[PDB]
RNA sequence: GUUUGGUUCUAUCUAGGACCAUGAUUAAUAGGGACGGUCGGGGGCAUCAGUAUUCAAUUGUCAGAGGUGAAAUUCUUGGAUUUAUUGAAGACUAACUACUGCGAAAGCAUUUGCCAAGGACGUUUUCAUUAAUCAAGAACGUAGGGAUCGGGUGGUGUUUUUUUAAU
């Protein structure tokens, strides 16, 4: 309602849009996933836009969706 | 209208969880280019293959200048070629069945939006002039 | 009240501590 | 056979439910990772043999 | 950044000559373009359906049927109206239908498929001012709050369910 138009509360900046803040920036994180077929690691975007495939055994990692892409139910991930 | 766009962050360097070299990204993008893929598709397949943000950040320059440096330049730019492809596709559909008056309207609009960009490209002279959409 | 009707980890934030968002020499 | 179906269902629903909650909260990997499970899937053996079948 | 061409100089490894295929930072909550899950009674072409309406055939029984404020005209024992079983024809899409959806506008409601297109969202993808405004021409004909539709994020209960895919 009535806040400082300089640096606001971190809850408020995480509340509002990623364009409407002071310094706009991303809200998609890069995450590393462990391929369950051959247990290696690869990097993948959050809003993945494409069915990414492992280089060792190209099974599947994430079917793309509109927003975040669904990780494919055997994969183990970590944010980074 | 509405806003829906990327928000490139405030940093301007490789995001330091990167564990990969610089010329390997160059080899990857010339490999996808010799496979025959358009630059925007190189950009998204590089966002998702190995964790780059974009090539102006991770390499020394943008993919258009790095592909002109590696000798795989496009003879016409991306938006020009894609509007030409959309124009010829809707022209082929209208010549399949001429009753589509909405496709006639959209062909007129795509012709206008491609002649605007052709005017820009001729006035900046990056394609050879006399180029006026056949 | 709607959001607290849903969620489970929501602190009853006191009005007398609503405005403080940071203190050097945190606690003794 | 009534006491047989009673005893067999009594141990089976117990082991099924504990396997279901065990795969529903199996968050920790030894190196940082979080296993994606999918909704209402009942077994780690089930997702393991599914990801073996999807090769 | 060439494919080759040719020279000599160490104890098969090396040195020094020439030809042959490239144009300044930021990425506007300015703009157009890619991509993705979608989204709509948006469009074009086929296709499917519904019971109506009219007409025809075949049954059935008998003096009226129609129409209006009253009538009248008309039709009717060669069976009008009504009933039942069908068959054909074109047009339209009852209820669902709302202060909801789409399209530049007029307008747009059955199903299914094809053909393209479009919008919003998502985006750490690309281009780098490409923008706006309209004669001529062209195609078609002051601030605040609640709710809802489309998309996305997070939460964590019921609907859901589980090794077939989907989400
Ligand atoms: Zn693997």
Curated annotation (Swiss-Prot), chain A:
Gene that encodes it: RPS27A
Localisation: Cytoplasm
Post-translational modification note: The N-terminus is not modified.
Reported function: Component of the ribosome, a large ribonucleoprotein complex responsible for the synthesis of proteins in the cell. The small ribosomal subunit (SSU) binds messenger RNAs (mRNAs) and translates the encoded message by selecting cognate aminoacyl-transfer RNA (tRNA) molecules. The large subunit (LSU) contains the ribosomal catalytic site termed the peptidyl transferase center (PTC), which catalyzes the formation of peptide bonds, thereby polymerizing the amino acids delivered by tRNAs into a polypeptide chain.
Cofactor field: Zn(2+)
Organism: Saccharomyces cerevisiae (strain ATCC 204508 / S288c)
Family the UniProt entry places it in: Belongs to the eukaryotic ribosomal protein eS27 family.
Modified residues (S-methylcysteine): 38
Biological process terms in GO annotation: maturation of SSU-rRNA from tricistronic rRNA transcript (SSU-rRNA, 5.8S rRNA, LSU-rRNA); ribosomal small subunit assembly; translation
UniProt-listed Pfam families: Ribosomal_S27e
Free-text cofactor note: Binds 1 zinc ion per subunit.
Zinc finger residue ranges, C4-type: 35-57
Coiled-coil ranges per UniProt: none
Miscellaneous remark of the record: Present with 43300 molecules/cell in log phase SD medium. There are 2 genes for eS27 in yeast.
Tree of life domain: Eukaryota
Designated name of the protein: Small ribosomal subunit protein eS27A
Record-level GO cellular component terms: cytoplasm; cytosol; cytosolic small ribosomal subunit
Keywords assigned: Cytoplasm, Metal-binding, Methylation, Ribonucleoprotein, Ribosomal protein, Zinc, Zinc-finger
GO molecular function, one term: RNA binding
Curated annotation (Swiss-Prot), chain B:
Positions of crosslink type Glycyl lysine isopeptide (Lys-Gly) (interchain with G-Cter in ubiquitin): 31, 35
Stored SMART domains: Ribosomal_S13_N, Ribosomal_S15
Subcellular compartments: Cytoplasm
Major subcellular location class: cytoplasm
Phosphoserine PTM sites in chain numbering: 24
Pfam families: Ribosomal_S13_N, Ribosomal_S15
One Gene Ontology term, aspect cellular component: nucleolus
Bridged cysteine pairs (disulfide): none
Keywords: Cytoplasm, Isopeptide bond, Phosphoprotein, Ribonucleoprotein, Ribosomal protein, Ubl conjugation
Keyword Ribosomal protein on entry: yes
InterPro entries: Ribosomal_uS15, Ribosomal_uS15_arc_euk, Ribosomal_uS15_N, uS15_NS1_RNA-bd_sf
GO biological process: cytoplasmic translation; maturation of SSU-rRNA from tricistronic rRNA transcript (SSU-rRNA, 5.8S rRNA, LSU-rRNA)
Entries under CDD domains matching the protein: Ribosomal_S15p_S13e (cd00353)
Family under the similarity heading: Belongs to the universal ribosomal protein uS15 family.
NCBIfam families in alphabetical order: PRK08561.1
Purpose: Component of the ribosome, a large ribonucleoprotein complex responsible for the synthesis of proteins in the cell. The small ribosomal subunit (SSU) binds messenger RNAs (mRNAs) and translates the encoded message by selecting cognate aminoacyl-transfer RNA (tRNA) molecules. The large subunit (LSU) contains the ribosomal catalytic site termed the peptidyl transferase center (PTC), which catalyzes the formation of peptide bonds, thereby polymerizing the amino acids delivered by tRNAs into a polypeptide chain.
Protein name: Small ribosomal subunit protein uS15
Species this protein is from: Saccharomyces cerevisiae (strain ATCC 204508 / S288c)
From Swiss-Prot, chain C:
Family label: Belongs to the WD repeat DCAF13/WDSOF1 family.
Residues of the full protein shown: 442 to 469 of 489
Any further remark recorded for this protein: Present with 6620 molecules/cell in log phase SD medium.
Annotated localization: Nucleus, Nucleolus
Ranges of biased composition (kind: Basic and acidic residues): 1-18
Name the record gives this protein: Protein SOF1
Role this protein plays: Required for ribosomal RNA processing.
Subunit structure of this chain's protein: Interacts with snoRNA U3. Interacts with NOP1 and MPP10. Component of the ribosomal small subunit (SSU) processome composed of at least 40 protein subunits and snoRNA U3.
UniProtKB/Swiss-Prot annotation, chain D:
Source species, domain of life: Eukaryota
Localization in the cell: Nucleus, Nucleolus
Subunit structure: Component of the 90S pre-ribosomal particle.
Family per similarity comment: Belongs to the RRP7 family.
Role this protein plays: Plays an important role in the synthesis of 18S rRNA but is not required for the 5.8S and 25S pathway. Is necessary for the cleavage at site A2. Is required for efficient association of RPS27 with the pre-ribosomal particle.
Miscellaneous field: Present with 2610 molecules/cell in log phase SD medium.
Protein name: Ribosomal RNA-processing protein 7
Shown part of the complete sequence: 180 to 234 of 297
């Amino acid at each position: 309602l009535v806040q400082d138009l300089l640096h606001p509360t971190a809850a408020s900046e995480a509340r509002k849009h990623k364009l409407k803040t002071l310094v706009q920036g991303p809200r998609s994180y890069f995450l590393d996933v462990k391929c369950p077929g051959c247990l290696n690691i690869t990097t993948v975007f959050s809003h993945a836009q494409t069915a990414v495939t492992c280089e060792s055994c190209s099974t599947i990692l994430c079917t793309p969706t509109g927003g975040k892409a669904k990780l494919s139910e055997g994969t183990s991930f970590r944010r980074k | 209208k509405g806003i829906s766009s990327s928000a490139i962050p405030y940093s301007r360097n490789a995001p330091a969880w990167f564990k990969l070299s610089s010329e390997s990204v160059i080899e990857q993008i010339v490999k996808y280019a010799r496979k025959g893929l358009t630059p925007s598709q190189i950009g998204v397949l590089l966002r998702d293959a190995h964790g780059v943000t974009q090539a102006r950040v991770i390499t020394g320059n943008k993919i258009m200048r790095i592909l002109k440096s590696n000798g795989l330049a496009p003879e016409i730019p991306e938006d020009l070629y894609y509007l030409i492809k959309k124009a010829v596709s809707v022209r082929k559909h209208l010549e399949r069945n001429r009753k589509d008056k909405d496709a006639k309207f959209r062909l007129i609009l795509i012709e206008s939006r491609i002649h605007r960009l052709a005017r820009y490209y001729r006035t900046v002279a990056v394609l050879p002039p006399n180029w006026k959409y056949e | 009240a709607n959001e607290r009707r849903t969620r489970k980890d929501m602190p009853y934030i006191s009005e007398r501590k609503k405005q403080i968002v940071g203190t050097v020499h945190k606690y003794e | 056979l009534k006491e047989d179906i009673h005893t067999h269902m009594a141990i089976f629903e117990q082991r099924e439910a504990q396997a279901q909650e065990d795969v529903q909260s199996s968050i920790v990997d030894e190196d940082g990772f979080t296993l994606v499970v999918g909704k209402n899937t009942k077994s780690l053996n089930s997702i393991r043999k599914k990801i073996l079948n999807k090769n």
